[PDB]
Ligand binder design. Structure first.
Ligand SMILES: NC(=O)C1=CN([C@@H]2O[C@H](COP(=O)(O)OP(=O)(O)OC[C@H]3O[C@@H](n4cnc5c(N)ncnc54)[C@H](OP(=O)(O)O)[C@@H]3O)[C@@H](O)[C@H]2O)C=CC1
Ligand SMILES: NC(=O)C1=CN([C@@H]2O[C@H](COP(=O)(O)OP(=O)(O)OC[C@H]3O[C@@H](n4cnc5c(N)ncnc54)[C@H](OP(=O)(O)O)[C@@H]3O)[C@@H](O)[C@H]2O)C=CC1
Ligand SMILES: CC(C)CCOc1nc(N2C[C@@H]3[C@H](C2)[C@H]3C(=O)O)ccc1C(=O)N[C@@H]1[C@@H]2C[C@@H]3C[C@H]1C[C@@](O)(C3)C2
Ligand SMILES: CC(C)CCOc1nc(N2C[C@@H]3[C@H](C2)[C@H]3C(=O)O)ccc1C(=O)N[C@@H]1[C@@H]2C[C@@H]3C[C@H]1C[C@@](O)(C3)C2
Lengths: 409, 409
């Protein structure tokens, strides 16, 4: 009687996001869907026990089945190394998975009509992605004690040098970088595939720098792959591609209506943080998806962390108000991609239905505390203005069952 | 009967900004001030005739007299090389002057109450500066044909190597950089001196990058020079200093009231453009000042170009509506700095009076076309909504004479 969903790689997480992960699976997914679920436990304890092998196994699983949904994990530091008595300070799992699959991360904010945004003029979505390290890119730096010269060199592997400074007085710091064309091509392919997947135009952002020969490369690569492999595909989808230099891109974007993909490029180390900033809107309403340049493999993930403070409240038995939208949308976007790969329209209908239910619920006046403060301001919110974690999950469950019952008339 | 203003280095410019430069000097300055004016003509023709020597002479003059006011010039390109039949494609004069004096450029928008700003929540000024090349900094880049390895090296001048990639398949692009501590110290000193000169707090913005050893240097240098040479100077001025990473700085700034100095740092090639963007507000209301790390030498300049299109209209005898505020404020800020160096309070009173007159005039409803459109929108402005270049200059003249006559009762 349930829907046959297919094969999905699951990755479990830590702390509060773990609690809510199991809530979602028990209340919103399994009652209506039957899955071929390949579950990997990326909790800090298990990762320590397997010496981080479980992370790699999960990554390869995603490489095999093309669909992965991940719960927020912990990136250990010294403090954590003490808390759990870890063997090593284990690397961030997100970076490992990303390095294995080789895609690009794109982040998005879920829009509700009664939730104010950073710019009031924004109506439509905005989806942002950065070209970060990993790769096939890498870099290095070091300090310089005193007078000397720093020079760069290149030794061809098949049978055969510049200068950056010959300074005299004073010390300093030197740095060198390399960037394969492959990472540029993968970044471009992933961007185009994302814009086609969403049906929005694509803008590429770039700085004006002294590194001219390097600046022109991103240009010519994006533009060429476009002219050769996506011109007509974009024509048929009524979307387009353009380049902007970021100084203009930011201003123009701030007085646009939204509705575009933003591929951000800084001609240096951008790195890829596990989470997005903090002051651009509620983090519970922000998602991320890792898209590979082949357009077939996808990893869905909440764009925030494990919410440690709330977990501390939960351990001591106190009332929490944690926003589950981002994780829910990890599940719904994963399942949606599954449906596209399988041409399973039941699954697609269910996923879009669950997203509609979440947005409708919040817009009807039922929300967690973070959104209530987002409306009024935290020094003005009262208890009657919001619902706790479990209350909100129950509300979502009710409204979902209702919508599905209506659809079956 | 006029005010004795002292020594001021003047630099004349090109095209429309030149026309308006002479208007300002004849209508707003010389009737009330008597100067020891060292005039250098940086018009494109003279720069070509002197092989750009006049630019250097001017720069040294500023080094001697500590005060320079500059009109917008032309940075020639191929087209210009044809238009004026130039010998070479002469370098931007602003870059030459800046390289000789060794300061930092700071940009600001003149606030009027009836002129909408990029963010409505902004009440107070915001003053922005970037750490750019020149120096003592420099960089380099180049393409890589195929398999090989790129490595960086450092040869000490006093008696004695890393690796950035050993890639196999594929070509790419490599790059190297160096940054003396001296440019960092000069950037910091200039920033602190600017915040003290204006009476606003100072925030330093920085990225999160893989170049860790290089990232910590800016940190420790700024913080140390602060702890040693400016802690009590900032205490007495009721201002403070803080660091932000730009991801948070942008968000927090967008919902602040303004009123701070913003020292922007990107761990790579920022370069220094002659002009600021375009979509952050009317360019006629934007200024720039070059401040040297010694806190004594200053160059005032409009933050826009020569306005070539308007000049084309003027050549053909058509009505123009060019905004003179930025240039006026170059004069007023130059004179103000002169007054501070000489403890000449007459001059300071006159400068602040002229700024007050400009702002009052615009706020009273008399403005050029760019601001009228800034209020309504260009498809809605009529001729009755604004005044042409000469009309507006005459209005300013009247209001200035009035204010001065009032002050003498
Ligand atoms: N694997 C991953 O994808 C990520 C993992 N992490 C891990 O997350 C853990 C904690 O990171 P942290 O620094 O706490 O950043 P978090 O995003 O985990 O929480 C940060 C703050 O943002 C607000 N917030 C975030 N999500 C929600 C939500 N769903 N509902 C309500 N408020 C929310 C809360 O503010 P308030 O407390 O004011 O309500 C919270 O304290 C660390 O161990 C880190 O390693 C970090 C980033 C992502
Ligand atoms: N030495 C310097 O400080 C600088 C020199 N330049 C030189 O300036 C010349 C032209 O540069 P350009 O690209 O035209 O940029 P400009 O700043 O000279 O003019 C650009 C546009 O901005 C608007 N604008 C700027 N200033 C005003 C003003 N005072 N009143 C009204 N509108 C204004 C106009 O838009 P609209 O036409 O829509 O009204 C104008 O067409 C070039 O030769 C360049 O080399 C460039 C930057 C600074
Ligand atoms: C347009 C400008 C006000 C810059 C906005 O910047 C960001 N906006 C985000 N959104 C988009 C919008 C919110 C959340 C979503 C929505 O409401 O629908 C998410 C992340 C960044 C972000 O990290 N931006 C950084 C920063 C702004 C630019 C881009 C990038 C790098 C940079 O150096 C320059 C600092
Ligand atoms: C706060 C964010 C919306 C970024 C704003 O950015 C800028 N605002 C300017 N103002 C300040 C404000 C207007 C004009 C004046 C006023 O109205 O009083 C002038 C220049 C830039 C600018 O060039 N910013 C660029 C860009 C925004 C950030 C800083 C910098 C580099 C970056 O990569 C990141 C792109």
């Amino acid at each position: 009687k349930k829907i046959s969903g297919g094969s999905v790689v699951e990755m479990q997480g830590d702390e509060m996001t773990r609690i809510i992960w199991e809530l979602i699976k028990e209340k919103l997914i399994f009652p209506y869907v039957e899955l071929d679920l390949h579950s990997y436990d990326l909790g800090i304890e298990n990762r320590d026990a397997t010496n981080d092998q479980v992370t790699k196994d999960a990554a390869e699983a995603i490489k095999k089945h093309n669909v992965g949904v991940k719960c927020a994990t912990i990136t250990p530091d010294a403090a954590r190394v003490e808390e759990f008595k870890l063997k090593q300070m284990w690397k961030s799992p997100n970076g490992t998975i990303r390095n294995i699959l080789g895609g690009t991360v794109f982040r998005e904010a879920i829009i509700c009509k009664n939730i104010p945004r950073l710019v009031s003029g924004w109506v439509k979505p905005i989806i942002i992605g950065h070209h970060a390290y990993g790769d096939q890119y890498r870099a290095t730096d070091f300090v310089v004690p005193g007078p000397g010269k720093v020079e760069i060199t290149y030794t061809p592997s098949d049978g055969t040098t510049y200068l950056v400074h010959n300074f005299e007085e004073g010390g300093g710091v030197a740095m060198g970088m390399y960037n394969q064309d492959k990472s540029i091509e993968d970044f471009a392919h992933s961007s185009f595939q994302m814009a086609l997947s969403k049906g929005w135009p694509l803008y590429l952002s770039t700085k004006n720098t002294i590194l001219k020969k390097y600046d022109g490369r991103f240009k010519d690569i994006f533009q060429e792959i476009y002219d050769k492999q996506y011109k007509s595909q974009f024509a048929a989808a009524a979307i387009w591609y353009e380049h902007r230099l970021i100084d203009d891109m930011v201003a123009q974007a701030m007085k646009s209506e939204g509705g575009f993909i933003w591929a951000c490029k800084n001609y240096d180390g951008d790195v890829q943080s596990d989470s997005v900033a903090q002051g651009y809107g509620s983090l519970g309403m922000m998602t991320s998806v890792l898209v590979c340049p082949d357009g077939k493999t996808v990893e869905a993930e909440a764009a925030h962390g494990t919410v440690t403070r709330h977990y501390r409240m939960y351990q001591k038995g106190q009332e929490t108000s944690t926003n589950p939208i981002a994780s829910i949308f990890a599940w719904t976007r994963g399942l949606a991609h599954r449906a596209k790969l399988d041409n399973n329209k039941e699954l697609a209908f269910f996923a879009n239905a669950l997203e509609e239910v979440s947005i409708e619920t919040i817009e009807a006046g039922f929300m967690t505390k973070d959104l209530a403060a987002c409306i009024k301001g935290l020094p003005n919110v009262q208890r009657s203005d919001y619902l706790n974690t479990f209350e909100f999950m129950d509300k979502l469950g009710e409204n979902l069952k209702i919508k599905l019952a209506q659809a079956k008339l």
